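Narrative progress, year one. The postdoctoral researcher (J.K.) led the effort to move from monomer predictions toward full complexes, under supervision of the PI. The following entry was the first complex the group processed end to end, covering 431 residues in total.
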Amino acid sequence: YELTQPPSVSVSPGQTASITCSGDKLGDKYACWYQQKPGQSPVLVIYQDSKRPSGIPERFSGSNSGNTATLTISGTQAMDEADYYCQAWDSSTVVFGTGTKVTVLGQPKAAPSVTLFPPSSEELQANKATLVCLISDFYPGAVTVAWKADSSPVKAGVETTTPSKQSNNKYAASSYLSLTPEQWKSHRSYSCQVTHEGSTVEKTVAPT
Amino acid sequence: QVQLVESGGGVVQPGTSLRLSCEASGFTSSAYAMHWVRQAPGKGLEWVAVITFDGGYQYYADSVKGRFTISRDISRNTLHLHMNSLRAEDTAVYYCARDPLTKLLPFDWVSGGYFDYWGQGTLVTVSSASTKGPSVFPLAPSGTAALGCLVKDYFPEPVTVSWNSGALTSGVHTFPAVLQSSGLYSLSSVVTVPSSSLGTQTYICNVNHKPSNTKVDKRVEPK
């Protein structure tokens, strides 16, 4: 059984953050939500689709209908910034959603700069090949990266970092695509596509 | 107060066995269904196993069944996760979690259960990675140009990069390393420079990996 959330939700202080969680007939299951800050244990904020544990601010609320469970944070504050995970059961099995990073905006939004490098000659000699996609100067610190060989999506051999702060308070990340020298020559083009706050930008390199 | 304290984590080789412990306090674990949940670095939560308050029933995620066994030391109010035949993708922080609703299993009715208490977690690193110096490759530049150095497959952290021994600093960005599934790190350093200077100016990246006593210079040039 599969539970999927959006990767990122961004919100200004005071605005309302809405986090969804989808699953087949999720409405027939009881949904829970957990809040997790970096380096800390998860904290239950909503159980049984809408019940709120004592100690949890009432600006947190939940709902669950049809295929969708929604966690709602009204009047979001900075302390609400965290990863949120939905949770349900499948027989005796517990299932978690993919998780949603909630950013509460604390500086202007900033679109990423993207630089894509092809495999070097020196590496192609050693019978190896790596594409290097470098992503810098973005905020919020949440990105999704998609690789494509010509026009087809690639998922194998992809390794991507978690975003981290630069010395200018924006974020950086990088993604690596591992290939054989043959795979590299076998296509006309390779692309790195970086999605950030609804915008997707692409860089492209070719074996030529 | 209620508390959970997990233990037994560490860095180990693939195929090896390891036993995690979670000691309860402020309550009796024999009155609750108790769970193990794990989280790979930078990834999401993944449920691993449950044992009933009775101890008479256990259940497991497919990814660990036949390899992991959950159990309870009633005398010492302690739960255990015995992991055999460990694999690289078992690398995670392992959390002990308490479930107040679940009693007998399988469920008679639909589960409204949840985790009200979590431990702090114990880290389990499964890797055969050992000390290894990086391969260093130039990233050739294509009114500016970006050029750099790829620092490939090293262990452990850290690697440091400079350019012309630290004489060139403007426009230098050295990225945080990626930790690949192999347990080896890679990083890149880039510098943006004038396109017109590519013919006269020399750009050399200096890569240092102290654990392997590796100091490598690589000249980076067009074409």
